[PDB]
Write an enzyme that holds these catalytic residues in place. Structure first.
Site, PDB file in Angstrom:
ATOM      1  N   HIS C  87      14.183  16.025  27.263  1.00  0.00           N
ATOM      2  CA  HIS C  87      13.380  16.882  26.411  1.00  0.00           C
ATOM      3  C   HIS C  87      14.341  17.628  25.549  1.00  0.00           C
ATOM      4  O   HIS C  87      15.517  17.753  25.897  1.00  0.00           O
ATOM      5  CB  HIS C  87      12.584  17.876  27.234  1.00  0.00           C
ATOM      6  CG  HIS C  87      11.441  17.255  27.958  1.00  0.00           C
ATOM      7  ND1 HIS C  87      10.325  16.776  27.308  1.00  0.00           N
ATOM      8  CD2 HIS C  87      11.248  17.008  29.279  1.00  0.00           C
ATOM      9  CE1 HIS C  87       9.490  16.254  28.198  1.00  0.00           C
ATOM     10  NE2 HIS C  87      10.022  16.390  29.403  1.00  0.00           N
ATOM     11  N   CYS C 129      12.978  15.491  21.695  1.00  0.00           N
ATOM     12  CA  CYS C 129      12.350  16.281  20.649  1.00  0.00           C
ATOM     13  C   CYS C 129      13.340  17.180  19.900  1.00  0.00           C
ATOM     14  O   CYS C 129      14.482  17.421  20.358  1.00  0.00           O
ATOM     15  CB  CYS C 129      11.111  17.032  21.153  1.00  0.00           C
ATOM     16  SG  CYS C 129       9.894  15.828  21.822  1.00  0.00           S
TER      17      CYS C 129
END
Lengths: 233, 4, 232, 4
Positions: C87, C129
């Site tokens: 992430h 991300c």
């Protein structure tokens, strides 16, 4: 694999040559800049672009003239190119007026807002500082953000170097390489070679030894989806 | 040399 | 014009595969990341990298892995590669325990800090991300910062997509391209084809519709000073 | 499809 270059014209090339600033911005005259604008204009003309040169623009000027350019019809153009020459700081270039975020300048050409550049390369060359670090050296739906390439003169957070008498290093290097290879190298090869040149060929000369003997490395950001040659070739 |  | 590839090792390749995450971060399980890491393992190993995979690292392990790697002797290696799967948000990637800045993990390899990699390519591939936007679609002293390439799976400010069953888009695409062309295409051509393949071949399938039929484009940042081929 |  390559961008289709089979169009009536190669495309528009806007050059923003910011040399003089309002005192209140704290920015100095950028001597050397007129050389860069000339060498760039001659160079991009040779490639086949319709080059337009603007000078000492305010921030509202810079926004507007770029917004309009994205509102033109580029249906017969293979690509678009914009070159900025100014003071800058991370994420931001100066008009004479002040400061404006680079993202706002370039977003006008996103796929969803300049549909006639959709699927074509949109190039930005930026000669500006990007903060204040010095480098010492050592001994098919298309994504709306697709097809940009930003060739910055330097890496984020660092200064960028200009010789008052010879031009900015980035631009000197760029023109030099584009003259010998504009028409026969792929764009990344060109810019890789420009990387090597700014890195190998220049070293700051300065009275203040804080600013003495520094180095520079440019920084290429590619969202392109195909190879780009400037010659139908 | 000067900085941008 | 080309980076000298004559060394007895291609070089080290570190793969950090973060699937898991401490509740206090409240980040979800990155299903599909295992197919990713295994495909990456096979590719980069074919290229000739000495590949090691580290699972659910935490911020400090990550820092340390890369500091320690920057500290080995790369004199007989052509290059160094590190792949991060995790992430992330803008400028920053997740450990299992929190977020650490990417700038920090890579600074270790600045030429002033890992000298046996001076004038040698350092490559980072980052599937994470980079914020929260969606893309809807339409129709010779060397600089200390020189010789890095960051291949990001997405542009700054945006999400990055992963299919539980097949893997992240960026990694599936990077791997098919590498399988076929790792040994004959220059690194920018390869990354350019991957940029093309991510843009054309994928479209988010989803409920929510706020998340339905979204698109992605990767983002390559090159400070390379030569062309980089993996063989000859 | 999930995001990262």
């Amino acid at each position: 694999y390559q961008y289709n270059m089979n169009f009536e014209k190669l495309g528009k090339c806007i050059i923003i040559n910011n040399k003089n600033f309002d005192k209140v911005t704290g920015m100095g005259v950028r001597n050397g800049t007129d050389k860069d604008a000339e060498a760039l204009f001659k160079c991009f003309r040779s490639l086949g672009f319709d080059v337009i040169v603007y000078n000492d623009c305010s921030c509202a000027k810079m926004q507007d003239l770029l917004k309009k350019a994205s509102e033109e019809d580029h249906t017969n153009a293979a690509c678009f190119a914009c070159i900025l020459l100014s003071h800058g700081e991370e994420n931001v270039i100066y008009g004479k007026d002040g400061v404006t975020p680079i993202k706002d300048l370039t977003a006008h050409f996103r796929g969803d807002r300049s549909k006639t550049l959709l699927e074509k390369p949109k190039l930005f060359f930026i000669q500006a500082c990007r903060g204040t670090e010095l480098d010492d050296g050592i001994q098919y739906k298309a994504p709306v953000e697709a097809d940009f390439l930003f060739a910055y003169s330097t890496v984020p957070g660092y200064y960028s170097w200009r010789s008052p008498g010879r031009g900015s290093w980035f631009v000197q290097a760029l023109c030099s390489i584009l003259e010998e290879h504009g028409k026969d190298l792929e764009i990344m090869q060109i810019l890789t070679r420009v990387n090597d040149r700014v890195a190998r060929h220049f070293e700051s000369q300065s009275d203040d030894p804080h600013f003495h003997e520094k180095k520079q490395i440019p920084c290429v950001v590619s969202m392109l989806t195909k190879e780009l040659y400037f010659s139908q070739h | 040399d000067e900085v941008x």
